[PDB]
Design a protein around this ligand. Structure first.
Ligand SMILES: CCCCCCCCCCCCCCCCCC(=O)OC[C@H](COP(=O)([O-])OCC(O)COP(=O)([O-])OC[C@@H](COC(=O)CCCCCCCCCCCCCCCCC)OC(=O)CCCCCCCCCCCCCCCCC)OC(=O)CCCCCCCCCCCCCCCCC
Ligand SMILES: CCCCCCCCCCC[C@H](O)CC(=O)SCCNC(=O)CCNC(=O)[C@H](O)C(C)(C)COP(=O)(O)O
Ligand code: SF4
Ligand code: SF4
Ligand code: SF4
Ligand code: SF4
Ligand code: FES
Ligand SMILES: [K+]
Ligand SMILES: [Zn+2]
Lengths: 115, 115, 310, 209, 95, 176, 96, 129, 263
């Protein structure tokens, strides 16, 4: 896991001493929440694909620096924060149901430009 | 669509209820405004002005228009209470400097072309 | 923004002039910000020393445009007119001595135990909370966020110039002050390359339906006279559309959302000023601070109300 | 490049933004009405007014979007539309070095949802939209005037609001204070009719009625 | 520049640096206030032939927005490739 | 590329800790500040002796407006109204008519100098170098009304300042 | 030339002067009326007519790029003079 | 069509109380809804395509100081543009402005024949070209 | 039901036989550039500004005078059509006087506007320009004839609409001039209408001279009371002063003409 950093450089972003287990539990939680979303939902398919790719990366790479380099999400604490943000987003999407058809078409020339 | 969404009130009675609450708040505020701003008017004069401002919009029947009028009235009340307005702002409801404009046909005909 | 909507390109010399005077402008703005911050704190002396340099840069502005402050010099299509002969020499003479003045400014503030007592751990903002509050520029990089429009989204010839982006670590007033001082140093560094790499050529797009022709052609050629007339009475028509273009202004990200309906006048022009979002965050950054700290927090968000209020 | 005057077109970013627009439309069909990319590579998402919070939250939080910064929030007045007000969200993604525009619509009497829960930056932008256009934002923590004078009547940035407004201010010595009066101009603003009777851009020609 | 040797030494010592080589007051080093007349170059389209405006008209190459979806196995995508990490400076990593 | 501005950790040995203790107790950096101010006290001030000495300007400087003439004494303005059209502040008011000799000349040419933003767009728009912004910048007035310029006022400005206006134009017209 | 009004007010080159009953003359009391005394019409009237030997002559106002847009003047009418519509200089063919 | 608590409302939209317009400039104004005529000086038709809303012109007097054109009409320069007549009348109605709207005048189609200029027995023959 | 099918940039339109290319483009909302063509006058086809490419046809055609054929595709924006317009505008501007600041047409010209919209932005004419002497045709129309582009609109109007055969052309080639040859007044109740049809400042209104620019005028649409025709007019005003009177089109009353008393 390499030498533990003294700082993440970013204010308010504390160093995670156990980033691998953190990411594993976050990604498994995300995959749990997506299981409730219908199979045909584009959000479910896309987020499952990216979440399982990231989880497989967190499993094929022990060292934190090479994992950070492969993830392309900044530092590992930033990756963890993004995982929490995606977990929150999936929980909200479970209630919003954006896979449903469009609520209402706009008026006839609502977006016509120029008028 | 055929119908529209409300601001707050789903009916005209709800709009009237909020109008009455706002009128109550303004009526109680008037003496504190007269004292605090050191206005040279009487509390009867200020409360009659509040009533006359309310009476301008008595013809409104749309509950959403009534709701927006209540919102703007509460905004004005909060500018008055928090002393964000100056004395000049409070005294602008009373057009003391503007001369009495003509109203009958003959005087308007005498002074110019405006209907 | 207007050139993006017009689908036209300013000439290379105009772009180099624009970058050079943008960095001169950054020096002017950072001098004003740091020195007025210090003057509000109670260090009045650095204000005068650096306002002499500001006066010299005002002279550069006036020599290129005829106005000390409001040049109206950079225009859609390029710049109004070319640099007068000998201007680059004077800019070089000024810039070769300016770092010594930054040194003297730091000799009074950077290590002073009273200046640090008024700026260290004052107005601390979290990086994520800086992002969510819409902060930009030094208010972002003070919290360690590695973001600069001149590098991530370069404009003009900024991709051809080499410089450093100073990054803070504590997100307080002291780190932001250090960032602004080092930005002055990197502005000098950019200005040197602009002086050495200024190319020949015209300084406005050679397309007389956007940029007015030279006065000599206007008085000799029929097309030039017609286009001068029309550009100075109706203006050029901009193809219909909307854009949001932003630059790395000295005070943060300055942008405009410019709507065109196809005519010669803008349909809508929303101006994005970094100071608006920064001053929206004064309440957050002043939490649990004394009254004298709010003066510092306002100074560290450097606020010009001309762009806050528009 | 034998065209030194024309702005160069970058097709790689155009394709990237097109693909991401397809992605966003597919993930949120419930709210996305239209997505388009300009010729200068700017991506816009047209949404139903109900989807402001869902779409904005998705763009902020999705790991493939990460639009953490609200660059600007403004409104545009188009009187010829029944929903005259066009609400524009400009968002920036530091992670993917990209920008996105989200637009919806409203009229004088329909409230837009406040997005202060998505972006803390929206607090003053929504107050400014309310001040200059009169658009109400439901659930705003503190909605009130921000730019105009206290007690100012009207919303100046509406297209039917006059340029100089309706009242002037001056100091009156009789009443010993600044007073407001109907506006009179010693020289009225001189309206210029500048538009050419000839069509400039054929590519934007609207089909005849 | 008129300061005596002793005063120059005193102020150099007090500031800790030789301030006589970087004086903030300008002198004969500046450019002359009267300059030779310029001769500015012409743009790329100052040509007599092969110069039709239809071949260099930027405004008339602008297009209306490309509609990629209107309400009226695919891999996930990002708005752009993820931004590369900035690398430390070589001139001065730590200030 | 980037750099850190405050990412140095102080050394924690005997000599460095004693250095910092001496700096704390003997006020050495405060003495450095006193030295910097003392060094500035012995520098020649940058002040100029106004009005006997003046700030340096350039031929492009945009000051008070003027209406110019040909060497024949004939006015240059042929009342095209381009300056009035382009004026960002609408500070220019023009009325014209055929002159008794048939010339196309103005009968009104007003500049509201309190509306003016001194941008110089009028002298750019002018096809005959009739309206210019001159070098004068010391024309403050004791009343608001003396800043609402007339055609007579602007022509007298032109006759007053033409000698140096023409020299400035000759200095800068090859850039225009 | 600059003349005087019956009230004594100075008449400008546009022919302006308040009438004897106009109250607006009170603005000049204890002051002066600003009148430019160089009437451009009388000045351009003093210039000679050039005897150029061509049917078409060109005039740019003198000083090249510092004059006015270059125009071409027809000199075929033998009763009139061809004058420049920018600067008022007059031209005519030699001795008809 | 959506969960917005659809409340029944009359179809007479009236936003006059919310516009902040002084009462004099609502009842007494009269707006004109029209497609502007083609400027007869030019033969370009690109300005006759949209509908215009203009207010009735009020008094302009002469400024005693400079002779400028003064006004007390805030709506002297207000000109709104619309895509159709219906949009303009809806906007005028919800703003409480009395309006008169005139039908758009378009050129009638015309039969142009160059060969008529050389007619064998008609008056359409031209005597010069 | 005898309509034929033609294409304007691929878009199909059904037109009566005898419809010209210009009209077929006009019914899709595309205005072909023109100087000499007027819909109320006879077709001249001399300015050549309306030249347009027919798809598959090597030679451009005058849109104002050429009847459409079945299956024709009008390429109103092809490169050949643009180059034709640029060449014609260059030829029109070769000898045109540099009078825009002193010409009353400036700001509402047509030559200016179509130079901006369809011609090049620069000149390669390196010679001396033409200059013709002025003609006096009465106290109503100021003829600065060196601005004339020889579109023959005035002559066609005078001969057909007004019925007076006084206008014409003398000479040929580059020195062909529009006028009356002899010194003669152009007196007619409809004489002032040759000012509006003139695309350039060659024919201008003497009363209106030097007095206003097009952009600053406010246009009030009203009715003429000088007679019982009720001609529709536009009243140009500026700073509270009536500036001039223009015709306002009404196909049923006055078309685009007014009488000299009205004007
Ligand atoms: C404690 C004071 C001790 C005596 C100081 C003497 C002094 O400063 O002499 C100037 C003399 C030159 O100073 P500088 O700043 O190098 O002069 C720059 C130019 O050379 C200056 O060149 P310059 O051409 O300007 O020199 C002309 C100047 C020369 O001025 C002097 O020589 C002033 C001498 C003052 C005694 O005289 C004037 O300009 C006339 C106006 C004089 C104004 C008032 C002078 C002081 C009056 C004191 C009260 C009297 C009652 O000082 C020295 O040589 C150094 C003295 C250091 C003393 C220790 C540190 C304090
Ligand atoms: C200190 C000096 C003064 C300084 C301060 C001077 C101003 C103080 C007041 C500022 C606010 C101003 O009144 C505007 C608002 O709040 S408007 C609320 C809606 N107003 C209506 O009218 C709705 C429709 N109206 C009806 O439905 C009925 O007509 C009515 C309710 C009137 C009576 O009902 P009732 O059952 O007959
Ligand atoms: S300088 Fe600018 S604001 Fe002043 S009169 Fe000229 S154009 Fe108008
Ligand atoms: S001053 Fe110049 S631009 Fe203004 S009207 Fe006179 S000639 Fe035209
Ligand atoms: S007719 Fe048109 S192009 Fe010719 S001088 Fe007049 S305004 Fe200029
Ligand atoms: S005078 Fe005018 S209308 Fe007559 S031919 Fe010449 S340009 Fe055409
Ligand atoms: S318009 Fe067809 S040739 Fe003149
Ligand atoms: K004409
Ligand atoms: Zn001349």
């Amino acid at each position: 896991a390499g030498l533990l950093k003294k700082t993440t450089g970013l204010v308010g972003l504390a160093v995670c001493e156990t980033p691998h287990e953190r990411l594993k539990i976050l990604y498994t939680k995300i995959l749990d929440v997506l299981g409730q979303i219908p199979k045909n939902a584009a959000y479910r398919k896309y987020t499952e694909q990216i979440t399982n790719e990231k989880l497989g990366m967190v499993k094929a790479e022990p060292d934190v620096k090479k994992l950070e380099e492969q993830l392309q999400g900044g530092q590992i604490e930033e990756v963890i924060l993004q995982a929490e943000n995606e977990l929150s987003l999936a929980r909200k999407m479970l209630r919003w149901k954006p896979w449903e058809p469009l609520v209402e078409e706009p008026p006839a020339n609502q977006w016509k430009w120029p008028i | 669509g055929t119908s529209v969404k409300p601001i707050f009130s789903r009916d005209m009675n709800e709009a009237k209820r909020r109008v009455r609450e706002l009128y109550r708040a303004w009526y109680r505020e008037v003496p504190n405004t007269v004292h605090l701003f050191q206005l040279d008017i009487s509390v009867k004069q200020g409360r009659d002005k509040v009533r006359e401002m309310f009476m301008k919009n008595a013809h409104v029947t749309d509950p959403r228009v009534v709701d927006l009028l209540v919102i703007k009235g509460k905004m004005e009340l909060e500018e008055t209470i928090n002393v964000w307005k100056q004395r000049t702002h409070i005294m602008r409801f009373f057009h003391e400097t503007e001369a009495p404009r003509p109203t009958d046909f003959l005087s308007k005909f005498y002074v110019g072309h405006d209907p | 923004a207007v050139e993006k909507l017009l689908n036209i390109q300013p000439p290379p010399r105009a772009q180099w002039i624009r970058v050079l005077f943008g960095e001169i402008t950054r020096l002017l703005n950072h001098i004003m910000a740091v020195t007025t911050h210090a003057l509000d704190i109670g260090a009045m002396t650095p204000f005068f020393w650096m306002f002499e340099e500001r006066e010299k840069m005002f002279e550069f502005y006036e020599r290129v445009s005829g106005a000390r402050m409001h040049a109206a010099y950079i225009r859609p299509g390029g710049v109004h007119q070319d640099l007068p002969l000998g201007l680059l020499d004077d800019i070089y003479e000024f810039s070769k001595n300016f770092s010594f003045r930054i040194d003297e400014l730091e000799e009074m503030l950077t290590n002073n135990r009273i200046w640090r007592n008024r700026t260290v751990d004052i107005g601390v903002v979290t990086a994520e909370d800086a992002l969510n509050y819409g902060f930009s520029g030094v208010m972002l990089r003070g919290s360690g966020i590695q973001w600069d429009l001149r590098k991530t989204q370069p404009y003009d010839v900024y991709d051809q110039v080499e410089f450093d982006v100073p990054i803070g670590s504590r997100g307080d007033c002291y780190d932001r002050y250090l960032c602004r001082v080092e930005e002055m140093r990197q502005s000098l560094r950019i200005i040197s390359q602009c002086l050495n790499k200024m190319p020949p050529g015209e300084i406005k797009v050679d397309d007389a339906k956007v940029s007015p022709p030279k006065r000599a052609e206007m008085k000799t050629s029929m097309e030039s006279l017609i286009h001068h007339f029309k550009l100075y009475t109706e203006g050029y028509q901009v193809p219909p559309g909307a854009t949001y273009t932003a630059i790395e202004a000295p005070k943060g990200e300055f942008g405009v959302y410019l709507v065109s309906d196809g005519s010669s006048r803008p349909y809508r022009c929303k101006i994005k000023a970094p100071g608006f979002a920064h001053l929206a965050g004064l309440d957050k950054m002043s939490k649990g601070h004394m009254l004298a700290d709010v003066v510092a927090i306002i100074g560290t968000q450097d606020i010009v109300f001309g762009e806050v209020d528009r | 490049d034998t065209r030194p005057t024309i702005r160069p077109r970058n097709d790689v970013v155009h394709k990237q933004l097109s693909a991401f627009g397809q992605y966003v439309a597919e993930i949120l069909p419930k709210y996305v009405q239209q997505v388009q990319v300009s010729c200068f590579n700017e991506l816009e998402i047209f949404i139903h007014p109900d989807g402001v919070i869902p779409v904005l939250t998705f763009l902020r939080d999705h790991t493939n979007a990460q639009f953490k910064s609200l660059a600007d929030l403004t409104a545009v007045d188009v009187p010829t539309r029944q929903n005259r007000f066009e609400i524009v969200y400009n968002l920036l993604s530091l992670r993917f070095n990209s920008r996105i525009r989200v637009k919806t619509y409203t009229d004088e009497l329909t409230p837009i949802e406040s997005s202060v829960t998505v972006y803390k930056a929206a607090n003053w932008y929504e107050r400014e939209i309310w001040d200059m256009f009169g658009v109400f934002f439901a659930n705003h923590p503190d909605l009130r005037r921000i730019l105009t004078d206290y007690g100012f009547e009207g919303h100046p940035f509406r297209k039917d609001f006059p340029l100089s407004g309706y009242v002037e201010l001056r100091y009156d010595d009789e009443v010993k204070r600044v007073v407001a009066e109907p506006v009179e101009l010693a020289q009225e603003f001189r309206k210029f009719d500048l538009n050419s009777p000839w069509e400039a851009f054929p590519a934007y020609r609207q089909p005849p009625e | 520049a008129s300061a005596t040797r002793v005063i120059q030494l005193l102020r150099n010592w007090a500031s800790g640096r030789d301030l006589q080589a970087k004086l903030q007051l300008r002198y004969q080093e500046i450019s002359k206030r009267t300059q030779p007349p310029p001769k500015l170059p012409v743009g790329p389209s100052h040509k007599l032939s092969n110069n039709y405006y239809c071949t260099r008209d930027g405004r008339r190459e602008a297009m209306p927005p490309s509609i990629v979806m209107s309400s009226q196995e695919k891999k996930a995508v990002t708005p752009a490739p993820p931004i590369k990490r900035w690398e430390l400076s070589k001139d001065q990593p730590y200030l | 590329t980037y750099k850190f501005v405050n990412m140095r950790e102080p050394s924690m040995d005997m000599k460095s800790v004693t250095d910092r203790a001496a700096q704390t107790l003997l006020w050495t950096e405060l003495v450095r500040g006193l030295g910097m101010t003392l060094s500035y006290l012995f520098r020649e001030p940058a002040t100029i002796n106004y009005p006997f000495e003046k700030g340096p300007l350039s031929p492009r400087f945009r000051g008070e407006h003027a209406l110019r003439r040909y060497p024949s004494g004939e006015e240059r303005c042929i009342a095209c109204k381009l300056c009035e059209a382009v004026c960002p502040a609408q500070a220019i008011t023009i009325e014209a008519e055929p002159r008794a000799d048939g010339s196309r000349r103005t009968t009104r040419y007003d500049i509201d100098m309190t509306k003016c933003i001194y941008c110089g767009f009028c002298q750019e728009a002018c096809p005959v170098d009739a309206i210019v912004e001159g070098p004068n910048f010391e024309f403050s007035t004791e009343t608001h009304e003396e800043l609402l310029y007339n055609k007579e006022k602007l022509l007298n400005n032109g006759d007053k300042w033409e000698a140096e206006i023409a020299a400035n134009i000759q200095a800068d017209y090859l850039y225009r | 030339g600059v003349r005087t009004s019956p009230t004594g007010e100075k008449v400008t080159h546009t022919g302006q002067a308040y009438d004897d009953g106009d109250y607006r003359r009170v603005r000049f009391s204890d002051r002066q009326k600003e009148v430019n005394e160089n009437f451009a019409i009388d000045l351009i009237a003093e210039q000679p007519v050039s005897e150029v030997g061509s049917r078409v002559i060109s005039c740019d106002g003198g000083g090249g790029a510092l004059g006015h847009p270059r125009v071409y003047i027809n000199l075929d009418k033998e009763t009139k003079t061809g004058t420049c519509g920018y600067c008022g200089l007059q031209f005519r063919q030699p001795h008809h | 069509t959506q969960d917005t608590q659809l409340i029944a409302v009359d179809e007479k939209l009236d936003i006059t109380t919310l516009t902040g317009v002084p009462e004099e400039h609502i009842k007494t104004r009269k707006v004109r809804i029209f497609v502007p005529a083609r400027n007869n000086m030019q033969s370009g038709v690109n300005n006759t395509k949209k509908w215009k809303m203009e207010f009735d012109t009020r008094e302009r007097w002469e400024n005693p100081l400079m002779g400028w054109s003064s006004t007390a009409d805030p709506l002297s320069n207000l000109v709104l543009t619309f895509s159709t007549k219906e949009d303009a009348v809806a906007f005028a109605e919800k703003n409480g402005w009395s309006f008169d709207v005139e039908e758009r005048k378009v050129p009638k189609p015309k039969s142009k024949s160059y060969g008529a200029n050389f007619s064998w027995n008609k008056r359409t023959r031209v005597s010069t070209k | 039901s005898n309509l034929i099918e033609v294409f304007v940039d691929g878009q199909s339109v059904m037109v009566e036989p005898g419809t010209t290319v210009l009209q077929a483009c006009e019914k899709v909302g595309m205005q072909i550039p023109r100087f000499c063509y007027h819909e109320r006058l006879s077709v001249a086809g001399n300015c050549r500004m309306c030249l347009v490419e027919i798809e598959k046809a090597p030679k451009v055609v005058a849109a104002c005078a050429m009847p459409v054929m079945k299956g024709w595709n009008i390429l109103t924006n092809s490169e050949k059509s643009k180059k034709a317009r640029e060449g014609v505008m260059e030829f029109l501007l070769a000898n045109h006087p540099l009078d825009c600041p002193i010409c009353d047409q400036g700001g509402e010209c047509d030559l200016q506007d179509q130079s901006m919209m369809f011609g090049s932005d620069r000149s390669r004419f390196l010679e001396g320009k033409r200059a013709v002497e002025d003609k006096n045709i009465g106290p109503l129309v100021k003829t600065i004839m060196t601005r004339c582009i020889q579109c023959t609109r005035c002559i066609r109007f005078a001969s057909e609409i007004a019925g007076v055969d006084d206008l014409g052309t003398t000479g040929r080639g580059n020195d062909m001039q529009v006028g009356t040859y002899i010194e003669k007044m152009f007196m007619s109740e409809l004489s002032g209408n040759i000012i509006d049809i003139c695309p350039v400042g060659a024919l201008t209104s003497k009363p209106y001279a030097f007095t206003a620019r097009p952009w600053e005028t406010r246009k009030t649409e009203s009715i003429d009371v000088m007679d019982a025709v009720g001609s529709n007019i536009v009243v140009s005003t500026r700073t509270g002063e009536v500036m001039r009177i223009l015709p306002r089109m009404h196909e049923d009353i006055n078309e685009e003409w007014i009488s000299d008393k009205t004007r």
